[PDB]
Design goal:
binds arginine; Solute-binding_3/MltF_N; Iontro_rcpt_C; 12 strands; alpha/beta; SBP_3_CS; 29% strand; D-Maltodextrin-Binding Protein, domain 2; three-stranded antiparallel beta sheet
């Protein structure tokens, strides 16, 4: 049905009483569609909690990962929460909040397969488009072929099928996919290639909303709500530092 695109200040959002949140929905357990086809995950629970702390009704918009930061700047939504690591290149285009979790990227292979970056010379490596995983693979240039996917779970499918040697993805995403599919004797998590701080994003220059999100996040972190949502999803506290 389309929508009115606008980069909205915090007070413009408050007048409307609803906050528009962009996410992907193909990155379990952070943001994904469940078995009854409803949007859920750690970041959805956290997004909802942020909206509530700002006195706002959340309206969720799911779309392809590579589109998110473009449509944010175009005004499709007010903020994005979809597991973006903070990087210098992205910060040119969007403003990041303080990070809502810390993580890193790992090499995942079948048992006996490549464990570390130096082992990827001559191999086929699968990554999601526009990710810090793709960037890491582009920095391991002895790779025979970097196969890039629109959706991260498709790279995993190709790993299991033998079409790639190695999948580079989030450490929590890899751990859960292995538990979830009972792959403990099939796949092998190797080197932590890099660490990253993961944050919400607002349109470039949208400082009023940026400040309001940071205030809400700090409030969730002090009032136990963040700790509760992190326990629910991970059985541990996943906050930075
Ligand atoms: N919703 C998603 N599929 N997100 C992928 C994010 C992956 C990685 N943390 C990055 O910053 O690029």
């Amino acid at each position: 049905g389309g929508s009115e695109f606008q980069v909205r200040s915090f007070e413009e959002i408050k007048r409307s009483g609803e906050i528009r949140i962009g996410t992907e929905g193909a990155f379990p357990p952070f943001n994904y569609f469940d078995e009854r086809n409803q949007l859920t995950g750690f970041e959805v629970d956290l997004g909802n909690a942020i909206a509530e702390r700002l006195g706002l009704k959340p309206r969720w918009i799911a779309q392809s990962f590579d589109t998110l930061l473009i449509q944010l700047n175009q005004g499709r939504f007010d903020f994005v929460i979809a597991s973006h690591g903070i990087t210098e290149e992205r910060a040119r285009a969007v403003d990041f909040t303080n990070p809502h979790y810390c993580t890193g990227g790992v090499i995942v292979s079948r048992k006996g397969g490549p464990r570390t970056a130096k082992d990827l010379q001559g191999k086929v490596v699968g990554v999601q488009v526009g990710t810090t995983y793709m960037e890491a693979a582009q920095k391991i240039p002895g790779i025979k072929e970097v196969r890039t996917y629109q959706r991260d779970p498709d790279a995993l499918q190709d790993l299991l099928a033998g079409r790639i040697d190695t999948w580079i993805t989030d450490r929590f995403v890899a751990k859960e996919a292995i538990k979830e599919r009972k792959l403990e004797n099939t796949l092998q998590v190797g080197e932590l290639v890099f660490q990253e701080r993961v944050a919400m994003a607002v349109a470039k220059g949208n400082k009023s909303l940026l400040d309001a999100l940071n205030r809400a996040l700090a409030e969730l972190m002090q009032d136990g709500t963040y700790a509760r949502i992190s326990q629910k999803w991970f059985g541990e506290d996943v906050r930075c530092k």
